[PDB]
Design a protein around this ligand. Sequence first.
Ligand SMILES: *[C@@H]1O[C@H](CO)[C@@H](O[C@@H]2O[C@H](CO)[C@@H](O)[C@H](O)[C@H]2NC(C)=O)[C@H](O)[C@H]1NC(C)=O
Ligand SMILES: *[C@@H]1O[C@H](CO)[C@@H](O)[C@H](O)[C@H]1NC(C)=O
Ligand SMILES: [Mg+2]
Ligand SMILES: [Mg+2]
Lengths: 130, 497
Amino acid sequence: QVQLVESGGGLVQPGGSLRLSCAASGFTLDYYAIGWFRQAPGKEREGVSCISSSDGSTYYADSAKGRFTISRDNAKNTVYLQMNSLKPEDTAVYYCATDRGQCTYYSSGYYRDLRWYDYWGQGTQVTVSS
Amino acid sequence: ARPCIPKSFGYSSVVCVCNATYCDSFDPPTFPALGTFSRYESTRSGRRMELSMGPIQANHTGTGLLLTLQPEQKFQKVKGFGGAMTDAAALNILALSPPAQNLLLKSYFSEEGIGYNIIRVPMASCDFSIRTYTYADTPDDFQLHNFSLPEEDTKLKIPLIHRALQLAQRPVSLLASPWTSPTWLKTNGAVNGKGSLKGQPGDIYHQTWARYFVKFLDAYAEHKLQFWAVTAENEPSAGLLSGYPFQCLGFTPEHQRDFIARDLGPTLANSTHHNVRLLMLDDQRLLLPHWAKVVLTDPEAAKYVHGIAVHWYLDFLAPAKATLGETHRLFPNTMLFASEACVGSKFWEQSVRLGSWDRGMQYSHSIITNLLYHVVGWTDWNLALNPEGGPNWVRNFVDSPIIVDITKDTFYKQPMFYHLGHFSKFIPEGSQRVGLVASQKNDLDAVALMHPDGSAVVVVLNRSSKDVPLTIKDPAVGFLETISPGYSIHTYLWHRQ
Ligand SMILES: *[C@@H]1O[C@H](CO)[C@@H](O[C@@H]2O[C@H](CO)[C@@H](O)[C@H](O)[C@H]2NC(C)=O)[C@H](O)[C@H]1NC(C)=O
Ligand SMILES: *[C@@H]1O[C@H](CO)[C@@H](O)[C@H](O)[C@H]1NC(C)=O
Ligand SMILES: [Mg+2]
Ligand SMILES: [Mg+2]
């Protein structure tokens, strides 16, 4: 039973910070690479950040680079997304997903492929509003 | 599943014949129950990845060789296996009728075949091209406004890569490598010969050359293709050689170090392609560890370098501890990746040997050696060639695991194909090499890995003419009793839980 549960979402003001967590059960974090994604209303689902299980290397969307940090607590089997300097354009549902490869949305041959993410959480709403 | 149709051509083993309506293939992967193992067997006498199964035994009593799995001794994780989509490979594949094309692609990339998950893509022309070109041949265009992909990419290479991606069992990673820059960036003004970029790192020539990598990734992404990694230059030592016959661009290790630190690293990092990984060297392993020390001890280059790409060429039987082993020890967090391998020959010897078992054993011996010295992946050269070993505009013909005969709408799968498949089919990305110790000195080559799901895979190569009785011990399940026949390769799989 693979299960992923997002938490940490909520409402923040522009310029604020939030840390999302993706609690994994049914496998160990040295098995699956794990990716964070979002869907802003009116847009398709987009990658935010992914972390490889083979070597821990990290991947970022252009808009996440330098603002957001993905990390793992290996003792708690949890993947975190620290988001800083949030803006209203960051309002979205945020999802974590298991990868059949190593951060394939960024690294595999088909541009922005979502095909290899085989399990998805229900997501957590993040709202950035004054 | 369909079996091999064997054909002999005067060497010590057979090729398998495929055409528009027939190719040997596998049924979907099925794993047998705990307490049972699977065995895939290929032999010089003709067996081709033939499947049998057997019980794991609770005890073992003889003497004779024992190989003990050490699942707690963990080494490197595997990136993958694959080959190169050269102009020559693309032309040979597209020379087949469409049904034969798809059987070839399935042989390499699908679960009906051997599950390749790497494709190397030359940036513009190399020796396995029939036309000399780069992507920016309009001179003195330093902002690369006239950069563009020709039909070699947009009609041949890119559609074939997309067809492979759609057939693939596993996620495929693309790796790109340039051979030459535009000639107006070069000291000698030609694609070949001894020559490097003009000037020095940081200047207009080096900045434009780094920008060319970005334009290349830009252009492939417009065609919906994205890259896991690029190398800093194919075989940079070649362009240091007087009279070098085909496309090259020379870098000393110091030149590559400074090009990475001043131009390539920052240019890629400042672009939308900042996630693409950079591999240094892309050359033969006797340049190690020296090349790695020069580049990676400079912090301003090392912070951009993800790994080290190594070539195998005319060195399949040479040692690896002082090169690959020592480089791993010095830089244990910098992955080593074999990005190109092919069988060359002496000038008076034949380029293609249809059915050569020796060339198969060279591939599998090289792969095992690489894996035993921490290398995370292994990439073949041309995916397909014609029976001459071409086409190749300087006649630098070589062998390939698949040989296409356009006049018969037929392709031949060499022993090389199956020797590589004994690894690529059964070692998915993320598999971890684990320890395997022998009870006595022996002539076998062997490697053990654990799948991400926890199951075991062991490859056993016997390059001798003598059968070797053999037992594999796994403390979790028991003893695997088997024989390794002379001139054979076996892959063993079993569930551990
Ligand atoms: C493609 O290869 C297959 C396999 O060798 C050929 O099919 C065989 O043809 C011979 C001669 O008619 C028969 O004796 C076999 O029974 C066939 N095998 C099968 C599985 O059908 C086929 O003829 C080849 N196609 C062409 C155009 O040469
Ligand atoms: C590239 O660097 C410039 C100058 O440092 C900076 O202004 C720009 O935002 C950077 N762009 C990217 C995509 O990193
Ligand atoms: Mg050797
Ligand atoms: Mg070469």
